[PDB]
Amino acid sequence: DAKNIKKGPAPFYPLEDGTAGEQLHKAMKRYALVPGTIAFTDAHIEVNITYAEYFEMSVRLAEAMKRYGLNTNHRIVVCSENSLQFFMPVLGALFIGVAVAPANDIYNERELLNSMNISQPTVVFVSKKGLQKILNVQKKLPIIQKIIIMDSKTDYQGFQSMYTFVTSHLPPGFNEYDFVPESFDRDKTIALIMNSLPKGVALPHRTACVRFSHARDPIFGNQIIPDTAILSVVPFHHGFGMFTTLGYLICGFRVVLMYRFEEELFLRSLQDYKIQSALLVPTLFSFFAKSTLIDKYDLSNLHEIASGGPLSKEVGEAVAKRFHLPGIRQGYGLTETTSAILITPEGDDKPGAVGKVVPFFEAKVVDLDTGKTLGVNQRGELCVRGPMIMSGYVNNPEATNALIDKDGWLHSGDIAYWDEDEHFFIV
| Residue-number span of the structural domain to which 340 is assigned | 1-427
The resolution, in angstroms to one decimal, equals: 2.0
Q: How would DSSP label each residue in 37-75? A: -EEEEETTT--EEEHHHHHHHHHHHHHHHHHHT--TT-E
Select from 139, 163, 137 the least CA-distant residue to 150.
163
Q: Strands 356-357 and 99-102: what pairing?
A: unpaired
Q: How would DSSP label each residue in 270-311? A: HHHTT-SEEEE-HHHHHHHHH--GGGGS--TT--EEEE----
Q: How many CA atoms lie within 13 A of 182 on its CB side?
A: 22
Identify the CATH number of the domain in which residue 225 sits: 3.40.50.12780
C-alpha–C-alpha distance, residues 60 and 44, integer Å: 27
C-alpha–C-alpha distance, residues 56 and 50, integer Å: 10
C-alpha–C-alpha distance, residues 29 and 62, integer Å: 14
**Number of folded domains in the chain?**
1
C-alpha–C-alpha distance, residues 290 and 218, integer Å: 32
